[PDB]
Amino acid sequence: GDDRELAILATAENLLEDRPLADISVDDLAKGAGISRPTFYFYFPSKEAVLLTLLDRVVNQADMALQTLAENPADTDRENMWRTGINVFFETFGSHKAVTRAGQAARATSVEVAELWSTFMQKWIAYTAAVIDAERDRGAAPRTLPAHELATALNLMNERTLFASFAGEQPSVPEARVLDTLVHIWVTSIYGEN
Amino acid sequence: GDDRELAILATAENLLEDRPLADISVDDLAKGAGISRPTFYFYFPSKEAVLLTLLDRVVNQADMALQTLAENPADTDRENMWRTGINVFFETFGSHKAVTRAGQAARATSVEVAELWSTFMQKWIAYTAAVIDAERDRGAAPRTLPAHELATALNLMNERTLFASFAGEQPSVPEARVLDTLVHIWVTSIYGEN
Ligand SMILES: CCCCCCCCCCCCCCCCOC(=O)CCCCCCC
Ligand SMILES: CCCCCCCCCCCCCCCCOC(=O)CCCCCCC
């Protein structure tokens, strides 16, 4: 039943491009997937469950991509190392704006969404801290702020800043400038002595 | 009618300390202020309007405080200059956690709240950019990223990071460490050459 489940997912991601989940019905998702309404309930308990699955797929895709970089570094300087890591998130979520927006708006009423985001953020923060620590160990970065607290703030900045740019918020950094903006902040705060 | 209006405001801020606005009724606010329910509607059209006023008071208090610092600098180094500026927000909103939380949760359904926050953020971003520019003009800070884009990201980081700390989110920087964390990121990214 992958086809019909994927068809429900694709339909949902497509519609979420024009309106919020609240304005999307199970029938819409059903008609979109070419199945009946009761048959939808065979794959998902609710439309909120569909969005959750969508976010879970986007989140894991970014995580897997980062995992790929971890295993296969890249012959380049330290500035580029961080840029490639940040780019994983700019590109993954930037290629799924509708789901990112819907996912954010869902956090307020979905503990599933909240816990999913929280778990990976902790995961991405722990990795950033490990890289910073490794960087400090080799003598490249000065031992300034506690690595994990620095990593948390930088990660929270990206979460908020990338979202603002993807959503075209007021205020926000233009999407065409956001990667460079974040990379500079990460690089100066990680290697800066003061 | 200041007394009764202020009594409605105080009552609301007090209750918001234990539960969300949704779990607070106009009667609660009414009983809390020692007036009847219909008399409440004499000062505010709704409870959502009360929270808006509360946020507006907290936002302006921070703005006025920053304005005071602008007019009356402080004989100290550049690192301390930024710390005092950031402290205005850490202290003002940190002394009104309930209203800050409620205010954030209200943004999703209140354009009044959204526009209020947006207007001052733009204002605080413009000021940060002016200081950065002044700093660059005098030769203290290197001309790296466009000042306004750097200012936007730093401000968005504070908004997200301070909120996470005040709310005790997972993940978050402990409140007792957040000021230092942010000041370091601001200082290194503003004066850092690379
Ligand atoms: C070697 C280099 C390492 C680089 C690590 C980079 C890690 C940064 C991870 C944080 C950024 C995540 C991108 C988020 C974009 C918009 O996020 C939305 O918020 C998603 C919706 C989820 C709901 C939760 C809302 C608080
Ligand atoms: C000379 C030094 C200048 C320093 C300037 C510092 C400016 C930083 C201003 C941004 C931080 C604001 C603090 C926010 C704390 C939590 O915010 C909540 O979000 C409030 C609720 C409002 C709802 C909107 C949610 C996006």
Swiss-Prot record, chains A, B:
The subunit field of the Swiss-Prot or TrEMBL record says: Homodimer.
All copies of domain HTH tetR-type, residue ranges: 2-62
The function of this protein is:
Involved in the repression of the monooxygenase EthA which is responsible of the formation of the active metabolite of ethionamide (ETH).
Q: Which UniProt keywords apply?
A: DNA-binding, Repressor, Transcription, Transcription regulation
Endoplasmic reticulum recorded as keyword? no
Q: What is this protein called?
A: HTH-type transcriptional regulator EthR
Q: From the record, give the cysteines joined by S-S bonds.
A: none
The domain of life is: Bacteria
